[PDB]
Amino acid sequence: HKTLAMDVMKPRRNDPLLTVLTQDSMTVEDVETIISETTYSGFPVVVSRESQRLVGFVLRRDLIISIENARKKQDGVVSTSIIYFTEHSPPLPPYTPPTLKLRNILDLSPFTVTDLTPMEIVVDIFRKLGLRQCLVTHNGRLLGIITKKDVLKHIAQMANFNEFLEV
Amino acid sequence: HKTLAMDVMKPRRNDPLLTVLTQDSMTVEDVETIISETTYSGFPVVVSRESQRLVGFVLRRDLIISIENARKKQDGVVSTSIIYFTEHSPPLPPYTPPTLKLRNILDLSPFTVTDLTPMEIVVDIFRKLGLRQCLVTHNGRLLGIITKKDVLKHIAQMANQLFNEFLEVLF
Amino acid sequence: HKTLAMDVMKPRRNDPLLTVLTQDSMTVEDVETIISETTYSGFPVVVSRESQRLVGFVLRRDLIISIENARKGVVSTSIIYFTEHSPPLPPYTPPTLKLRNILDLSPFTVTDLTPMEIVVDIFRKLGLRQCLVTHNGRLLGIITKKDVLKHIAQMILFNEFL
Amino acid sequence: HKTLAMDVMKPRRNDPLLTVLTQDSMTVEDVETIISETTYSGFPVVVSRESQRLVGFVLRRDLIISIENARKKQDGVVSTSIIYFTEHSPPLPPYTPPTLKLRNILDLSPFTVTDLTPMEIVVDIFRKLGLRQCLVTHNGRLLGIITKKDVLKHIAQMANFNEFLEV
Amino acid sequence: HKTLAMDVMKPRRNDPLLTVLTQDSMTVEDVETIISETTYSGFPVVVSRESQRLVGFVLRRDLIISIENARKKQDGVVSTSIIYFTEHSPPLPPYTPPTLKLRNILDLSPFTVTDLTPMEIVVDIFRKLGLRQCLVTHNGRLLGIITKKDVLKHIAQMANQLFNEFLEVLFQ
Amino acid sequence: HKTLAMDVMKPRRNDPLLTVLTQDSMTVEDVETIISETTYSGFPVVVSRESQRLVGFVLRRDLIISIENARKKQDGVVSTSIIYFTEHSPPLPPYTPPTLKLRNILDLSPFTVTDLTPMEIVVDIFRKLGLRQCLVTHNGRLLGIITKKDVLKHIAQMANQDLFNEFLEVL
Numbered sequence A, D: 001h002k003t004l005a006m007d008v009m010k011p012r013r014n015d016p017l018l019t020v021l022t023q024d025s026m027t028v029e030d031v032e033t034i035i036s037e038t039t040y041s042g043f044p045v046v047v048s049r050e051s052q053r054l055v056g057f058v059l060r061r062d063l064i065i066s067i068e069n070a071r072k073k074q075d076g077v078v079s080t081s082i083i084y085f086t087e088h089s090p091p092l093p094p095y096t097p098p099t100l101k102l103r104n105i106l107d108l109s110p111f112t113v114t115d116l117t118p119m120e121i122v123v124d125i126f127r128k129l130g131l132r133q134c135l136v137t138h139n140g141r142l143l144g145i146i147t148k149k150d151v152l153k154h155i156a157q158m159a160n161f162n163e164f165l166e167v
Numbered sequence B: 001h002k003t004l005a006m007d008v009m010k011p012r013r014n015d016p017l018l019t020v021l022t023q024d025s026m027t028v029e030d031v032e033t034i035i036s037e038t039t040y041s042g043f044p045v046v047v048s049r050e051s052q053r054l055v056g057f058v059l060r061r062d063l064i065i066s067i068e069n070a071r072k073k074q075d076g077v078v079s080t081s082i083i084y085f086t087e088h089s090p091p092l093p094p095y096t097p098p099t100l101k102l103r104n105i106l107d108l109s110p111f112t113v114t115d116l117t118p119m120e121i122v123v124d125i126f127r128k129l130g131l132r133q134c135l136v137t138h139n140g141r142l143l144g145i146i147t148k149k150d151v152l153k154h155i156a157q158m159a160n161q162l163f164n165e166f167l168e169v170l171f
Numbered sequence C: 001h002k003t004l005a006m007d008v009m010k011p012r013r014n015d016p017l018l019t020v021l022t023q024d025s026m027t028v029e030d031v032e033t034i035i036s037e038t039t040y041s042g043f044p045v046v047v048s049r050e051s052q053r054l055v056g057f058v059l060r061r062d063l064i065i066s067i068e069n070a071r072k073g074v075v076s077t078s079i080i081y082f083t084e085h086s087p088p089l090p091p092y093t094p095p096t097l098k099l100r101n102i103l104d105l106s107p108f109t110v111t112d113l114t115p116m117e118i119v120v121d122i123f124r125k126l127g128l129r130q131c132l133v134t135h136n137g138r139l140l141g142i143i144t145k146k147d148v149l150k151h152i153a154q155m156i157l158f159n160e161f162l
Numbered sequence E: 001h002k003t004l005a006m007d008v009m010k011p012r013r014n015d016p017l018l019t020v021l022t023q024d025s026m027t028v029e030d031v032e033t034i035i036s037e038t039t040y041s042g043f044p045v046v047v048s049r050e051s052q053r054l055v056g057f058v059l060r061r062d063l064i065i066s067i068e069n070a071r072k073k074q075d076g077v078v079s080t081s082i083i084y085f086t087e088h089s090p091p092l093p094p095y096t097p098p099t100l101k102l103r104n105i106l107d108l109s110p111f112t113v114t115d116l117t118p119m120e121i122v123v124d125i126f127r128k129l130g131l132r133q134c135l136v137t138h139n140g141r142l143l144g145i146i147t148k149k150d151v152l153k154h155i156a157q158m159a160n161q162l163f164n165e166f167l168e169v170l171f172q
Numbered sequence F: 001h002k003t004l005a006m007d008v009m010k011p012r013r014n015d016p017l018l019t020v021l022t023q024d025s026m027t028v029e030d031v032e033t034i035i036s037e038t039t040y041s042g043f044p045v046v047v048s049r050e051s052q053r054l055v056g057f058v059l060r061r062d063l064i065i066s067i068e069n070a071r072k073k074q075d076g077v078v079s080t081s082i083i084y085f086t087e088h089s090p091p092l093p094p095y096t097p098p099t100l101k102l103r104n105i106l107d108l109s110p111f112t113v114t115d116l117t118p119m120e121i122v123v124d125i126f127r128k129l130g131l132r133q134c135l136v137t138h139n140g141r142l143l144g145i146i147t148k149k150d151v152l153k154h155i156a157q158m159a160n161q162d163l164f165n166e167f168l169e170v171l
């Protein structure tokens, strides 16, 4: 009966899984096919798909420019080059291509809310803090995302309730 | 060096670990001793000690009332009764006393900030949202706590001193 | 230990009572003499001096303008009323004057026992120039914006009220 | 022209008087019966019914708890004890049963607005100070009450003009 | 795509030009006919008509009171008396009637926005600063006006659709 | 003496005129020497030096980036190439090099305040709108600039006093 963060977050019920980058296991081609196949403004970065523990958030525009420059740089970066967002590379097999550190375009302090947070509180946070997006979590794990336009679409939905009257 | 959330949060460098409750595995006696041995206004609730995954925040004031109400009823809840913050009671062996659900006093939406967040941005969040406290995390794992008083103490340190940074509180 | 509105409000203990105006018993001269003696930024208006019931607040800068323009059968013995209509006067008395349209009919009020941390809070959140202090419906004193500032200079717990 | 506080306040025209407490003359059963026959979140307290000079505002919650704990205390509190919200008891004859002071649960600083105050301002005050209710006075005389729920219903009705857009 | 200050500002396309006062060159009579023939709350005053450089904003009611009080004085102030909002009286031909200084009723700090400014930004400024009106310029030249009611009408129209700009208002 | 915007704005009487770019007549070489010789975060662009009519505000960051890119390209910009911020190019003599349109990095709606605006009002505006800087005009003409830091320093001066009541209002 009470609208919560999980009710508004994407993905919804019949939506695909959250489009996420791993901190350690994405190749340059993986991320490029993500950039070409999506229009999302940004991507959460997690430790692994298993943990779904949030490492940060990275914008599409930054990735394009970074990777674009990277292949353009002759450090030898190729398609099968592993990208990492950690300070140091992960352990790599004998004959593997040069890596690409993208730590410097990662937002290490993304705004996050619990899935059980009331939407009234999320709306308020968005207004007072001027958020462009919010990540939604359950017990430390990444579940979904709420953007500014999602918040607006939710407000619109209510407008047709007394919770709409207090916003 | 810019001051971050990790620089203001407790525990400080090489102090004992955050005083936390588990969502599942602590008894009334556990909580009783924690309450008895500490004066903290509240406690983070974590999935487990090894996971340190944040579940919520629970006030001492509220723990006291609930545990004292649980005693008076004399309905099986004893010192060896398990306290749980989940929706359902944890699976327990035979002859174990009834459990105590304290979920209704758990704040399941505590505010959180990464350990790397600039204190400037923390101070602003406290001001804009009127936070009583803030929890500090690393990669989804609970690390520390900052309270309104910790922020005020931090601001006071700047106030009478780097003074321009204090004036950033106005903006 | 807690400082209240009655500890900051004027008049202080043993000070001349509030320079107030009435709504039915204030002649032009009585107002002109008050302006020519005091230098307060504004004056409250009450039903009567005996009732001390708050009707509104009128600024000083607003009083002089309206008085000097109405005398250019308004004399020194003309009763000024802050109500909507003139009170019943004897047939011989000269015409009256209405200053209703320059009175703040919705001034802000606080009780004499209101904690200053709340008075200051209301001054910041509403941006008040002044606040009238009452006790059980009766005007008692006044706290201006400068009084709040002088109380802010008094005060650890200072940064908490920011 | 403008809608004023006296257009939204309760009680409405041809409605029953405000359910109020006196500061000196309510007994223990008097208040209890008032509590039982009403559902209002709270009640104003006035010097006397004749004066309607506002003394404070007390919540239903606090009245219930205070009164119940007073009978449990062996001060000798009974059904016919005088309840007062003043600092000291009213002049009583010696043979009268011990009294019950309830000043410590009275809001001595309730927010008040004059009846001529435009609702625009009232809404603003409610929004800026986050009020639960406001008391409406006329020349130092309590006239009515405006709660937050009252204000929201008023905003709702505005939509059905640009006094609405003003808010 | 998104609405600009120039889309909301008045006067609209092909209506008479902004009604302004010059800082230096208009007569008591000029202002009086403007006052009695319009209902605008106020008027921008500009350096000159050729420059359209904003000096300030002046309320109608203040002009009425000030001009009324002046003609009743006299000094001198006749229909052909020049009104100036500058600090000093303008250089004038010999044996002309006394001038009228109305600077003490001029708002020398009006708020201005460029015509290219998004309404979303304009609405936010009006809100946060509590503006009564806003003047709109092009490259330092006065072009138009937007009053609080103009903003309110804009928001109202926005609700009947671009519609996300109205949702941005309910959100801010 | 009530402090006004002209009292806090730069340049002060002792300073050289504002460092400004023109909308139409600066070459790439002109803007590069300016960037080399100054440390200002940004520059107002005016119609012309004589008119000082404001067109916008451009940042140093963006000037550097955009210019570095323009001269890297074949058949791109050279020292003598004219930069412009207008929608269309100015009329140039034939056989002159390619021009550089920098309209796309220009803030076309920079906040502006008249020189006679009380500083108290300027401060309110900075806080409420969250400005980085504010351009100060006299009768439509660009006169000076007030940056956030300028404002913070002005406030600090009022704090380090004992005038102090005027600082308390800011608090």
Ligand SMILES: Nc1ncnc2c1ncn2[C@@H]1O[C@H](COP(=O)(O)OP(=O)(O)OP(=O)(O)O)[C@@H](O)[C@H]1O
Binding pocket: A009, A010, A011, A017, A018, A019, A020, A039, A040, A041, A042, A043, A044, A145, A146, A147, A148, A149, A150
């Ligand atoms: N990385 C992601 N993975 C899955 N869904 C996402 C991701 N990022 C955003 N979304 C969701 O997809 C939708 C598109 O959001 P996106 O960030 O692409 O722009 P937006 O916030 O809708 O605003 P706009 O389209 O104006 O930039 C939103 O509902 C958002 O919650």
Ligand SMILES: Nc1ncnc2c1ncn2[C@@H]1O[C@H](COP(=O)(O)OP(=O)(O)OP(=O)(O)O)[C@@H](O)[C@H]1O
Binding pocket: B009, B010, B011, B017, B018, B019, B020, B039, B040, B041, B042, B043, B044, B145, B146, B147, B148, B149, B150
């Ligand atoms: N659960 C906890 N475990 C470890 N340290 C804590 C915990 N809770 C609070 N602290 C730290 O202990 C100190 C005091 O905590 P407390 O909860 O008493 O908050 P406080 O507001 O400082 O005290 P008070 O509410 O009386 O002003 C603070 O520095 C706080 O960060």
Ligand SMILES: Nc1ncnc2c1ncn2[C@@H]1O[C@H](COP(=O)(O)OP(=O)(O)OP(=O)(O)O)[C@@H](O)[C@H]1O
Binding pocket: C009, C010, C011, C017, C018, C019, C020, C039, C040, C041, C042, C043, C044, C142, C143, C144, C145, C146, C147
């Ligand atoms: N009507 C009044 N009667 C008695 N005292 C008053 C009255 N109005 C204000 N005061 C007191 O007079 C003192 C001076 O305030 P005053 O009204 O002169 O303005 P201020 O607060 O000094 O600010 P300013 O003079 O710059 O407008 C204040 O402490 C105020 O409480």
Ligand SMILES: Nc1ncnc2c1ncn2[C@@H]1O[C@H](COP(=O)(O)OP(=O)(O)OP(=O)(O)O)[C@@H](O)[C@H]1O
Binding pocket: D009, D010, D011, D017, D018, D019, D020, D039, D040, D041, D042, D043, D044, D145, D146, D147, D148, D149, D150
């Ligand atoms: N003491 C009172 N006497 C008369 N009417 C009252 C009194 N208190 C409240 N009311 C009116 O009764 C109605 C119900 O108000 P009440 O305080 O009971 O709750 P509310 O403000 O409606 O909020 P909620 O219904 O969610 O508890 C409101 O219109 C209010 O104005």
Ligand SMILES: Nc1ncnc2c1ncn2[C@@H]1O[C@H](COP(=O)(O)OP(=O)(O)OP(=O)(O)O)[C@@H](O)[C@H]1O
Binding pocket: E009, E010, E011, E017, E018, E019, E020, E039, E040, E041, E042, E043, E044, E145, E146, E147, E148, E149, E150
């Ligand atoms: N000097 C002016 N010249 C041309 N148009 C103006 C001028 N002043 C205002 N306007 C426009 O004329 C219309 C009426 O403006 P005006 O200020 O008279 O009333 P308003 O903004 O509706 O406020 P009010 O209800 O108090 O009269 C508005 O659309 C406004 O933009």
Ligand SMILES: Nc1ncnc2c1ncn2[C@@H]1O[C@H](COP(=O)(O)OP(=O)(O)OP(=O)(O)O)[C@@H](O)[C@H]1O
Binding pocket: F009, F010, F011, F017, F018, F019, F020, F039, F040, F041, F042, F043, F044, F145, F146, F147, F148, F149, F150
């Ligand atoms: N284009 C300019 N011409 C003249 N003076 C300027 C110009 N731009 C800024 N200033 C002034 O020069 C000083 C430095 O401004 P600048 O924008 O370079 O840095 P700042 O914002 O003051 O501080 P910071 O180094 O943190 O950005 C300030 O006093 C500012 O008012």
Ligand SMILES: [Cl-]
Binding pocket: A051, B051
């Ligand atoms: Cl894990």
Ligand SMILES: [Cl-]
Binding pocket: A139, B047
């Ligand atoms: Cl889990």
Ligand SMILES: [Cl-]
Binding pocket: A047, B139
């Ligand atoms: Cl890790």
Ligand SMILES: [Cl-]
Binding pocket: C047
């Ligand atoms: Cl009467």
Ligand SMILES: [Cl-]
Binding pocket: C051
């Ligand atoms: Cl009486």
Ligand SMILES: [Cl-]
Binding pocket: C136, D047
């Ligand atoms: Cl009394």
Ligand SMILES: [Cl-]
Binding pocket: E138, E139, F047
């Ligand atoms: Cl031009």
Ligand SMILES: [Cl-]
Binding pocket: F012, F013, F014
């Ligand atoms: Cl100087």
Ligand SMILES: [Cl-]
Binding pocket: E051, F051
């Ligand atoms: Cl010119």
Ligand SMILES: [Cl-]
Binding pocket: E047, F139
């Ligand atoms: Cl000039």
